[PDB]
Amino acid sequence: EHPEFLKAGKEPGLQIWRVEKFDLVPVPPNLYGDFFTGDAYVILKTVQLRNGNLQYDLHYWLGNECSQDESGAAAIFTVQLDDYLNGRAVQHREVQGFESSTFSGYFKSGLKYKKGGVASGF
Amino acid sequence: SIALVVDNGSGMVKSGLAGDDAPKCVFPSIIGIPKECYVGDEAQNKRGILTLKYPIEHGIVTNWDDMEKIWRHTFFNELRVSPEEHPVLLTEAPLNPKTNREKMTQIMFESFDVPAMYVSIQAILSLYASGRTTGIVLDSGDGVTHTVPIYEGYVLPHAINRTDMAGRDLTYYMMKLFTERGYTFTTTAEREIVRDIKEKLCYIALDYDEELKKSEERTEEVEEMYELPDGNLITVGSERFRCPEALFNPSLIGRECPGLHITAYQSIMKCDIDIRKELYNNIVLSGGTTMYNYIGERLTNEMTSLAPPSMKIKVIAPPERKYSVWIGGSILSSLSTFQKMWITKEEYDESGPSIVHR
Ligand SMILES: Nc1ncnc2c1ncn2[C@@H]1O[C@H](COP(=O)(O)OP(=O)(O)OP(=O)(O)O)[C@@H](O)[C@H]1O
Ligand SMILES: [Ca+2]
Ligand SMILES: [Ca+2]
Ligand SMILES: [Ca+2]
Ligand code: NA
DSSP: OOHHHHHTTSSSEEEEEEEOSSSEEEOOGGGTTEEETTSEEEEEEEEEOTTSOEEEEEEEEEOTTOOHHHHHHHHHHHHHHHHHTTTOEEEEEEETTOOOHHHHHTOTTOOEEESOOSOOOO | OOOEEEEEOSSEEEEEETTOSSOSEEEEOOEEEOOOOEETTHHHHSTTSSEEEOSEETTEEOOHHHHHHHHHIIIIIIIOOOGGGSOEEEEEOTTOOHHHHHHHHHHHHHTSOOSEEEEEEHHHHHHHHTTOSSEEEEEEOSSOEEEEEEETTEEOTTTOEEEOOOHHHHHHHHHHHHHTTTOOOOSHHHHHHHHHHHHHHOBOOSSHHHHHHHHHHSGGGTOEEEEOTTSOEEEEOTHHHHTGGGGTOGGGGTOOSOOHHHHHHHHHHTSOHHHHHHHHTTEEEESGGGOSBTHHHHHHHHHHHHSOTTOOOOEEOOTTGGGHHHHHHHHHTTSGGGTTTSEEHHHHHTTGGGGSOO
16 A cells, blocks of 8 residues: 555644655645645645544646646546545646635635646656 | 557557657457457458457456457557567556456567556547546447546546447448338448448538428439449448437437437546536547547537526537547556656565556
8 A cells, every 4th residue: 555645634733745757746835825836736635523423525627738647547546545545535627827716725825836747757 | 668559449449659640550449260360451351261359348358368469469560669678558448347348458568578567548548539527428438438527637426327329330330221112232242332321422411300391392402323332333322311310319229318418427427517518518429339420519509498597508529539538548658757657666566467457
């Protein structure tokens, strides 16, 4: 089992991974909200229900300059992570500049963007 | 590592290595009979002495002996790769019968001694390739056209529609249209000529009745010359748009089944109302028969006229449409999380070919 999956959704909070050469790599917390427009990301938002169970919302974010392998992997990782969470997550596709209000609300100071990113796996 | 990706179609085989941009070996899925023995393009060149056999019909394997030969040719002659040293990713049509799924798994392990394998639904790989987990995929190839609603990474089997009209039927339609002109394309090679004519010259008319009027008046604005292999020139006029029009109006070739847009609409209607909005917004085209110019715009207009008012319709038509299935597979089998998704030799030896189901 992939080590990052084991860390996913253990407690309420925000978890973000970046797709890096066909793999899921956790983004360092101090960089949360600062997205490379040349990359794709996977975001898990965990919320405690009023009854003990956990709520799961999966957001995969696609930069305008990310390559096909990255956007493809981000979507696949999303399904696989949802499978790991027993299909209990709601999946959301997020496009640069067109992010949902919910996804935007995750970041108190708002979404930031920056050019570049990790090279394509192809 | 390194995984082999094989997308088996009714007419074409898409094969290559996991992590590549595109399939490196694309050849026809044909066996040439003067068993077998000629497989691939070599059965197309020396076709004058052989008769052609298709192991896959309408997306479904009907001859497992010939299919097994295509695979041997794929590994040995094309990829030049030993299959017992690589994990292999295969593809299947939506609603593929379990008997064929088990036979495919049996052959790979018993006949090819594959260390690990996996089977993916074609439409799903195309959606992934487009960077989506939810949408309606219109897969349209040589032998079959599939309309597959997909929600959160999984197909909705009760909403899947299938029409056996596709590229090959369109090729014969063009042959019929050239017949009423005086020509007689009938042989193996002649069918291949017309197929090339169809791919190179055809396009989708936005307004069919208007284009039909246009070609009958300003004929020069539609006519194109095509150079036959003998050097002769044939004029191609209204056939350019009349031929792929059959995709939207199958009654042209004498079929009762609804057109591409209607079949997609009915699939969406067979889905939960709470997801239809997302499906309209994520219509994804795949397959060679979706390559016709202006097909995205035409379909977009058709769907809008059927959909409820103010419904947002988006038709995605990726340039690499012919290889979206393979590409989605190449990405999938390249992921670090796919190492434990494989069906291993060990898992087969203590469960048998019934292992494909999960
Ligand atoms: N540029 C093009 N324009 C129109 N048609 C094309 C073009 N390129 C390929 N085709 C058609 O696409 C068909 C094959 O496409 P594809 O490989 O996606 O299907 P397949 O997998 O072989 O068959 P199926 O998907 O039905 O099992 C052929 O019939 C061919 O005529
Ligand atoms: Ca990148
Ligand atoms: Ca889910
Ligand atoms: Ca196909
Ligand atoms: Na949408």
